[PDB]
Amino acid sequence: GAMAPSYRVKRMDIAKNDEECVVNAANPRGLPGDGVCKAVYKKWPESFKNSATPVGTAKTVMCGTYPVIHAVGPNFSNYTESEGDRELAAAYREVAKEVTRLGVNSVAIPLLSTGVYSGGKDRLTQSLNHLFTAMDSTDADVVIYCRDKEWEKKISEAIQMRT
Numbered sequence: 001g002a003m004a005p006s007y008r009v010k011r012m013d014i015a016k017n018d019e020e021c022v023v024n025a026a027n028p029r030g031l032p033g034d035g036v037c038k039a040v041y042k043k044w045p046e047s048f049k050n051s052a053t054p055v056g057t058a059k060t061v062m063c064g065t066y067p068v069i070h071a072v073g074p075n076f077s078n079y080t081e082s083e084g085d086r087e088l089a090a091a092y093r094e095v096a097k098e099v100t101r102l103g104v105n106s107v108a109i110p111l112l113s114t115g116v117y118s119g120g121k122d123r124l125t126q127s128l129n130h131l132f133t134a135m136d137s138t139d140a141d142v143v144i145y146c147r148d149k150e151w152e153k154k155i156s157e158a159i160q161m162r163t
């Protein structure tokens with residue numbers, strides 16, 4: 001585990017992370033996809049061998065010795081707010097299980113269901129709070145990756161508010 005487990009936020013491409021493993025914001029079919037998923041496909045294409053997994057689950061595939069945790073959040077275009085919220089919570093609980101199983105001291109993680117799976121809503125707070133519910137009992141250093149300058153400020157403020 002980390003000596004003093006922390007949360008941090010960085011505004012940059014998660015394919016350039018400095019952590020011991022990465023969480024892909026995957027689609028259920030293990031396809032290259034777009035956004036974070038396409039960046040992850042270009043950087044770790046070997047990790048997409050048999051990476052298909054259902055909504056609300058995470059499936060780890062090794063690229064060399066580097067673990068890629070494919071986490072499948074719900075597309076809020078298709079799910080009801082209620083069922084989508086349950087699947088989004090579940091995906092992050094499965095990430096925490098994988099991070100623990102792998103024995104890593106650090107993980108790079110995007111905000112699941114905040115981009116093309118957001119159904120056109122701002123889900124920063126919803127997605128981040130489910131990330132914290134899952135990851136608070138883990139001892140890995142967590143580094144959250146985002147692309148927007150206003151999102152960076154809001155995530156940083158949310159981390160600092162817990163102290």
Ligand SMILES: [Cl-]
Nearest residue numbers: 011012013016
């Ligand atoms: Cl970048």
Ligand SMILES: [Cl-]
Nearest residue numbers: 114115116117
């Ligand atoms: Cl998304």
Ligand SMILES: [Cl-]
Nearest residue numbers: 146147148151
């Ligand atoms: Cl963002």
